[PDB]
Amino acid sequence: EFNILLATDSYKVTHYKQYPPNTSKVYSYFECREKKYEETVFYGLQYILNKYLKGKVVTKEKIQEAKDVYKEHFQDDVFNEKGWNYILEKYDGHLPIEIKAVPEGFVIPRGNVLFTVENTDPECYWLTNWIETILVQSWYPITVATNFREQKKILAKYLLETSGNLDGLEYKLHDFGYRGVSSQETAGIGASAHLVNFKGTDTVAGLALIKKYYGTKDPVPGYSVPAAEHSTITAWGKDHEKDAFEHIVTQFSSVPVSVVSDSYDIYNACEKIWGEDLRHLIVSRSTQAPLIIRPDSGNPLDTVLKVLEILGKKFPVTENSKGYKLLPPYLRVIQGDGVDINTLQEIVEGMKQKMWSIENIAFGSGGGLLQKLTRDLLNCSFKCSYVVTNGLGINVFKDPVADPNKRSKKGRLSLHRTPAGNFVTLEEGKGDLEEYGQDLLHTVFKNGKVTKSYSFDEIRKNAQLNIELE
Amino acid sequence: EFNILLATDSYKVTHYKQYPPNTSKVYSYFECREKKYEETVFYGLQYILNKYLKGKVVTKEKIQEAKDVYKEHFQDDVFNEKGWNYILEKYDGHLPIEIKAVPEGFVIPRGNVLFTVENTDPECYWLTNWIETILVQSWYPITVATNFREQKKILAKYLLETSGNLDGLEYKLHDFGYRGVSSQETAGIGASAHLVNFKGTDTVAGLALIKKYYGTKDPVPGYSVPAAEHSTITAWGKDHEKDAFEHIVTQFSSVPVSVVSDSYDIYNACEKIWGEDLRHLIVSRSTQAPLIIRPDSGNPLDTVLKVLEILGKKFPVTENSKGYKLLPPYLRVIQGDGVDINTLQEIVEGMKQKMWSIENIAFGSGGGLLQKLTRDLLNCSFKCSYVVTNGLGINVFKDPVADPNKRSKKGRLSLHRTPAGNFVTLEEGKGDLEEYGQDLLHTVFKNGKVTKSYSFDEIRKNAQLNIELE
Numbered sequence A, B: 001e002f003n004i005l006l007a008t009d010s011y012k013v014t015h016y017k018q019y020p021p022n023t024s025k026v027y028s029y030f031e032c033r034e035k036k037y038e039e040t041v042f043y044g045l046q047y048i049l050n051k052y053l054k055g056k057v058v059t060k061e062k063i064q065e066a067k068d069v070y071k072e073h074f075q076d077d078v079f080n081e082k083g084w085n086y087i088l089e090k091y092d093g094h095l096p097i098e099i100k101a102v103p104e105g106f107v108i109p110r111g112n113v114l115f116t117v118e119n120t121d122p123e124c125y126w127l128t129n130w131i132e133t134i135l136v137q138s139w140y141p142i143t144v145a146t147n148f149r150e151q152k153k154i155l156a157k158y159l160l161e162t163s164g165n166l167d168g169l170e171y172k173l174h175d176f177g178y179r180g181v182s183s184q185e186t187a188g189i190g191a192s193a194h195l196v197n198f199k200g201t202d203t204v205a206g207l208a209l210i211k212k213y214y215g216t217k218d219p220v221p222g223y224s225v226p227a228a229e230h231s232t233i234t235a236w237g238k239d240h241e242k243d244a245f246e247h248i249v250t251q252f253s254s255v256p257v258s259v260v261s262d263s264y265d266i267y268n269a270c271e272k273i274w275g276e277d278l279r280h281l282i283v284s285r286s287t288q289a290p291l292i293i294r295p296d297s298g299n300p301l302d303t304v305l306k307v308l309e310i311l312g313k314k315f316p317v318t319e320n321s322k323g324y325k326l327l328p329p330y331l332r333v334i335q336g337d338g339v340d341i342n343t344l345q346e347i348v349e350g351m352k353q354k355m356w357s358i359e360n361i362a363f364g365s366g367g368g369l370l371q372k373l374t375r376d377l378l379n380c381s382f383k384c385s386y387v388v389t390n391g392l393g394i395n396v397f398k399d400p401v402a403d404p405n406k407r408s409k410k411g412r413l414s415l416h417r418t419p420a421g422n423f424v425t426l427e428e429g430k431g432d433l434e435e436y437g438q439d440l441l442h443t444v445f446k447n448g449k450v451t452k453s454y455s456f457d458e459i460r461k462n463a464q465l466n467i468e469l470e
Ligand SMILES: O=C(NCc1ccc(S(=O)(=O)c2cc(F)cc(F)c2)cc1)c1ccc2n(cc[n+]2[C@@H]2O[C@H](COP(=O)(O)O)[C@@H](O)[C@H]2O)c1
Pocket: A171, A172, A174, A175, A176, A177, A178, A179, A180, A181, A199, A200, A201, A202, A223, A224, A225, A226, A227, A228, A256, A257, A258, A292, A296, A333, A334, A336, A337, A338, A362, A363, A364, A365, A366, A367, A368, A369, B009, B010, B011, B375, B376
């Protein structure tokens, strides 16, 4: 089981000794520093508050456990037993910390305060940055939620242009990333961030996380349909791919089914097997139960265009009111190999140039996508901006000579609406002047309690695209 | 709590219906496919076996939980209740699976079988690839362990060249990556993979994982020492950086201490503050308690060289028996900003060109490093190679026309020593001919039990460098 005393960077065990004497407040903040990704979706903090930070997180056994680990880890007695004892005794092991944050799902320009952290008891001045390590991991859900929102913008633009509406937009990017991320916990967190934007997922761990920590309007927040994998095709033997296809589509005759078609030869599969041998089993399917053919290899754009071209020559094609080609309603395509933000855009643009509607296609996003995301992408950063020492508030910051991009904000911070309705972060306590109306940060955690919560519904609403609102 | 019935990709829920009728065995394998990283360290499977796969992992409540989720997730009844019931009743919820694997810590060339998975009961033919998703996540510890071994090779080469020995090699790359990875679980797994190669870490989660799932020779598998962070320097106020430095080194006068020195001006900090104002507090320190100065911004190579140059002009420098410059034993440097496999090599080479011993420096590795690692780097791949249908064994594989790199191995597999002592993977059951001696894969899991285990000690020994052995 989890011990918060063992869930920090080792050096932070030694920091209580290092602050200026008689420091009664350490106040820190998180932002996605400025200097493509101009706005970020704030999401994921609530998961961390609930799983790791709330309630009685300190016990005598956890204190003794950490004392023993750190004695061996540092080969010395540096662990602050007294400090944690104080928390245990005075607060019944609840953390004397207050966290204020912008609402989950909010879409905020870079370079704004997203949350602040401070101690509520002068003796716990050291606790603020002890928990930096765990809080800074919010970089991941923020970054995943942001990246998928950007992909949703691309899909919305092209779907609107080629079809005239946004029908089905929320099912156009399906999460395939479960196996390609680094852990079960990461799979759940990342999938939950995908689901802020979309409704189709195979990462079941995301469903469980959302139900436990956020809650949903509907029984589940995401959906899937039956589909083959290479093993269920190749198990039939090379010469029996047709038999596998027939078996599978028949077993799933009345619901949508997707069938990977590139095990041996995608082009032969589409033209000869689906297009001729089994064509009678396709054209008889309901609109509510299409076959969704999946290529999974080759150049993504070339293979999609070539598959569309083949199907278009074997199946009746219509031209929609925008002038774009549309497969019959019982037949669609999904591309789930090598799809990232760059290649997604390349494919939909290539489709548009060849006069194919984006209605025809869906995409699957893999795990490598998310693995390539780093805390550096949006410059997710946690810094101390204010301390009280000897009863005097002091505005503090770093400003390394060889990197002005690493300069940090100074003093007490607050987040506001501008007269033009944008966001602004006020430094040095200037929010107190009340020239910019109400601080948009809410207290979400205080003294062991989660004081403000968001349902997954509120988060999805906050994260909507403008084009979705228009 | 964790439900294995909900820990797969959604589509795999539907696969039991898709295999050829009367299939009694599905046998699959994992490899780091061929086609820089020519050999990989096999590590991490044991964590997964113990945490997720062993014992009674199926219960009636878990079956009903999954049934309810999947009914809503698919908007249909597709979940295989009967199959999981069978496991619960016949095997007391233990998984009828056998996994055979190369020993943990083994260093193996690409394109070899690393583990195999098969069902042990004909009714559970579908269970083999149900668990693909969870097993394939072994890509992460394998890849992290491999990447850190490659960095260790670079450090060993340059430390030997510039000092004549490998003293301290195992403390030259310290894990700083806790905050920059995607979750607590990932932090633990990745840190454990780092610790296969090194002994210095700040990712405390790695200690806990190793103690629980592998076990160590010593009380803990990794160590750290006290150190500042920017907040403990900047909290003093801009004009009092000197006061912060003095306070910190005095508080830690008798143990090693590292102090980040770039809050405002790294070059002034080294030349004027450490080099003049506080120089008397440095030259008085024990060899067992050096000050380790940390730059953390600017071009990594340039800043390291400039810091060395400055310290060399303010402190007595010796020339070792190899002809390289060496700071006094109470003074060292650590660079923990932007260090990856490329930049590490650039820095040690640049140091070598300026005649500085690698004894002078240590490195910190960040989280972005590990985030940039993907399952694609070593081409980690899980494929079905053999099925038994109608009592007949059939060798199966995929071979997509537009990507011969995605071709898979055929038939029953085994791993062997070659006459020249290298590794070879035999396909199509050819291992049974016994022309290549004993299969190197061991049964590590069978029917709910972990049948062979490795201590962290055996893994570290297996993963040693050749130069360490020589
Ligand atoms: O089909 C799969 N699921 C079912 C499915 C069927 C149809 C649609 S749809 O047309 O959007 C649609 C949605 C809807 F809600 C309703 C509808 F009617 C239709 C969506 C989903 C399916 C397929 C593949 C798959 N996977 C999970 C991992 N994978 C593979 O695993 C690998 C991932 O590894 P990397 O991370 O390295 O990339 C890669 O091979 C990757 O293809 C899942």
